[PDB]
A paper describes a structure:
Importin-α binds directly to the NLS and then recruits importin-β via importin-α′s importin-β-binding (IBB) domain1314 to form a ternary complex that can dock at and move through nuclear pore complexes. The monopartite cNLSs bind to the major NLS-binding site located on ARM repeats 2–4, whereas the bipartite cNLSs bind to both this major site and the minor NLS-binding site located on ARM repeats 6–8. The NP protein encodes an NLS at its amino terminus that has been shown to function as the major signal necessary for the nuclear import of vRNPs242526.
The N-terminal region (residues 3–8) of the NP ncNLS adopts an extended conformation and occupies the P-3′-P2′ positions, whereas the C-terminal region (residues 9–14) forms an α-helical turn and packs against the P4′ position at the minor NLS-binding site. The main chain of the N-terminal region of ncNLS is oriented and anchored on importin-α through multiple hydrogen bonds with the exposed asparagine/tryptophan ladder along the NLS-binding groove. K7 forms hydrogen bonds with V321, T328, and N361. R8 forms a salt bridge with E396 and also makes a cation-π interaction with the indole ring of W399. Juxtaposed to Y10, the hydrophobic side chain of NP residue M13 makes an intimate contact with the nonpolar patch on the indole ring of W357. Thus a small subset of NP ncNLS residues, namely K7, R8, and M13, make key contributions in nuclear import.
Author numbering:
A (entry chain B): 3 to 14
B (entry chain A): 76 to 105, 111 to 496
Write the structure that this text describes.
């Protein structure tokens, strides 16, 4: 497996 | 002068009467809807084409600029009056001060929304704008002029729904890269903001930017002292590492990780949060990329952030940890535990935020899977208990969220 990329809008 | 006096002077066939009147309309605006009601905006726009009279050109651009800085109805009045193609024509004016007025004006218009932005683009503003910046020495340009040109370009890059046309971004990008090598803080800031806008989208938008070779200069700007420079630089870097592993790799190879000990400990909350966000996406990468986080000695810094930061920054730290444990090796996870990750992780299990609970439980689950391959599950269990973790995990069995009570139930039955 591998970690989850989160875009800027996904952070906020 | 009152409105009627100006209307008479502007509508006369005497050029100097027209000039005097436009000067008066400038100072009044310096009663917008009464000016518009008299239909003076199309007069101002036509005066922009009087090449043989730069004074009335200047006065008109000024008047049109004031009205455009008002409400949406007034800005569209200026636009539907035809200010956009008129201003674009003045970009190549032999009068530099007139060209500058046109730049600033086109900048405000384009910065209103995607519609007006694309209108400025579709009337062909980009080529003459870039031509102005194609000089061998940027210092030949007025500092205010250069700043306005940069700010205008960033507005042409700004906004989604829809994002700017691909060909437009393609034409603008190399100029933005060169502006990143400037020394003026404001020029650097706007250029970085422009980059942050372009990297705020699908991987294809990221790839365009990264392929231009912009990353090494971004990383350098990341180390600047000026906060108005660091903030968009960090945003741009952050957006890039949301992409593919290889796009993220180019950030790493540029030496970005060396700046993060200062970023993660920066007194400004926003900088800390977005640096931690950035780290979370890097630990979401491959094992060799996670190892780079380790080698730069960033793990104790992440542990520090998870322990002693504001809650929303703590949440970003919890994401970094879980992403670490998802892709990391058993060896990388062991080192993580030795940096004292367990207690601050447990402390946040009592947070009222459902998302961070799910995220932390996933981290715990991943760490147990590593302990299993070590034959050290009991010791991990005892460690989690001794820092108040067991009490919190059990309380989470009566949680309202399905993912939470399932995971915590699983952990209890399985290891406790």
């Amino acid at each position: 497996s591998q970690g989850t990329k989160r875009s800027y809008e996904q952070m906020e | 002068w009152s409105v009627e006096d100006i209307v008479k002077g502007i509508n006369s066939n005497n050029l100097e009467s027209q000039l005097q009147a436009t000067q008066a309309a400038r100072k009044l605006l310096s009663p917008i809807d009464n000016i518009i009601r008299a239909g003076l905006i199309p007069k101002f726009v036509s005066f922009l084409g009087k090449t043989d009279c730069s004074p009335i050109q200047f006065e008109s651009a000024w008047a049109l600029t004031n009205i455009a800085s008002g409400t949406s109805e007034q800005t569209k009045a200026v636009v539907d009056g035809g200010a956009i193609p008129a201003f674009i024509s003045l970009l190549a004016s032999p009068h530099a001060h007139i060209s500058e007025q046109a730049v600033w004006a086109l900048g405000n218009i384009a910065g209103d929304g995607s519609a007006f932005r694309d209108l400025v683009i579709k009337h062909g503003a980009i080529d003459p704008l870039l031509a102005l910046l194609a000089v061998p020495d940027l210092s030949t340009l007025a500092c205010g002029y250069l700043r306005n040109l940069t700010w205008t370009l960033s507005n042409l890059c700004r906004n989604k729904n829809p994002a700017p046309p691909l060909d437009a971004v393609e034409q603008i990008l190399p100029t933005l890269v060169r502006l990143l090598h400037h020394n003026d803080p404001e020029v650097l800031a706007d250029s970085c903001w422009a980059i942050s806008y372009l990297t705020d989208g699908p991987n294809e938008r990221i790839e365009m930017v990264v392929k231009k070779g912009v990353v090494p200069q971004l990383v350098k700007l990341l180390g600047a002292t000026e906060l108005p420079i660091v903030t968009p630089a960090l945003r741009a870097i952050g957006n890039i590492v949301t992409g593919t592993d290889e796009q993220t790799q180019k950030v790493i190879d540029a030496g970005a990780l060396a700046v993060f000990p200062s970023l993660l400990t920066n007194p400004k909350t926003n900088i800390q949060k977005e640096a931690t966000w950035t780290m979370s996406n890097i630990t979401a990468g491959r094992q060799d990329q996670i190892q780079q986080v380790v080698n730069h000695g960033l793990v104790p810094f992440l542990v520090g952030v998870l322990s002693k930061a504001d809650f929303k920054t703590q949440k970003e730290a919890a994401w970094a940890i879980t992403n670490y444990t998802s892709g990391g090796t058993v060896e990388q996870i062991v080192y993580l535990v030795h940096c004292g990750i367990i207690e601050p992780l447990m402390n946040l299990l009592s947070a009222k935020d459902t998302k961070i609970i799910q995220v932390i439980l996933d981290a715990i689950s991943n760490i147990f899977q590593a302990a299993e391959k070590l034959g050290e599950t009991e010791k991990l269990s005892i460690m989690i208990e001794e820092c108040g973790g067991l009490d919190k995990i059990e309380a989470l069995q009566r949680h309202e969220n399905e993912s939470v009570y399932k995971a915590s139930l699983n952990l209890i039955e399985k290891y406790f």
